[PDB]
Amino acid sequence: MISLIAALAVDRVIGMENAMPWNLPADLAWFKRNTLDKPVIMGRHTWESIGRPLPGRKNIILSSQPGTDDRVTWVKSVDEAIAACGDVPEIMVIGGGRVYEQFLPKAQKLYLTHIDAEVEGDTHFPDYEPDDWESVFSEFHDADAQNSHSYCFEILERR
């Protein structure tokens, strides 16, 4: 099955031209936990912002152009990305906006981090209808000396 993992602020904002104005190490540990040892699919833009291959994961990059890094797998379409994943229990789609939009309709689970932050952004997670999903797990956390804003982890299963 296919799952999407994303961190969203209010208004579903997930990205902007500059780095996000937040520091959430706990959210990053959550991302790592949920993605280790699974293939992760991402768009070229996301790849660039990440900067290097995520360790302990099969990295698949979507791009209309020829790949520029032989350490990861590059594909030219959604179908080819799925196939490059092989026979695995769970495929994780890590963004960005374009990518999420194309995989949402095919996903069975969403791992979302809701951040209590208002930011101007130019990229949004796709709108989803709550009633179409079941919240199977949720856990709120307040900001702390290490995390700049409060946040909530939620796992949704498609009904």
Ligand X SMILES: NC(=O)c1ccc[n+]([C@@H]2O[C@H](COP(=O)([O-])OP(=O)(O)OC[C@H]3O[C@@H](n4cnc5c(N)ncnc54)[C@H](OP(=O)(O)O)[C@@H]3O)[C@@H](O)[C@H]2O)c1
Residues annotated as binding site for substrate?
A: 5, 27, 52, 57, 113
- Is 34 a binder of ligand X (CB under 6 A)? no
Q: Which two tokens stand for residue 93?
A: 């789609």
Identify whether the C-beta of residue 110 lies closer than 8 Å to the C-beta of residue 95.
no
Nearest Cα residue to 32 out of 69, 2, 7, 63? 7
Contact 116, 104 (CB under 8 A): no
The secondary element (H helix, E strand) that includes residue 57 is: none
List 22, 26, 57, 63, residue binding ligand X (CB under 6 A)? 63
Task: Name the residue number minimizing CB distance to ligand X.
Answer: 96
Asked if 112 is part of the footprint of ligand X (rule: CB under 6 A), the reply reads: no
Single out the segment in contact with ligand FOL by CB under 6 A; choices: 25-33, 80-88, 128-136, 141-149. Answer: 25-33
Candidate residues 49, 68, 108, 138; the one interacting with ligand X per rule CB under 6 A: 49
Q: Is 97 in the site for ligand FOL (CB under 6 A)?
A: no
In the list 29, 83, 88, 136, the residue contacting ligand FOL (rule: CB under 6 A) is: 29
Assigned token pair, 8? 């969203």
The answer to whether 31 contacts ligand FOL (rule: CB under 6 A) is yes
37: left (phi over 0), alpha (psi -120 to 50) or beta: left
Nearest to 138 by CA among 154, 156, 114, 151: 154
The structure tokens 């999903």 sit at 133
CB of 97 to ligand X, least distance (A): 3
The answer to whether residue 28 forms part of the interface with ligand FOL (CB under 6 A) is: yes
Using a 10 angstrom Cβ sphere, with 0-12 exposed, 13-18 middle and 19 or more buried, the burial of residue 13 is buried
Binding residues vs ligand X (CB under 6 A) = 6-7, 14-15, 42-46, 49, 62-65, 76-78, 94-99, 102, 123
Binding residues vs ligand FOL (CB under 6 A) = 5-7, 27-32, 46, 50, 54, 94-95, 113
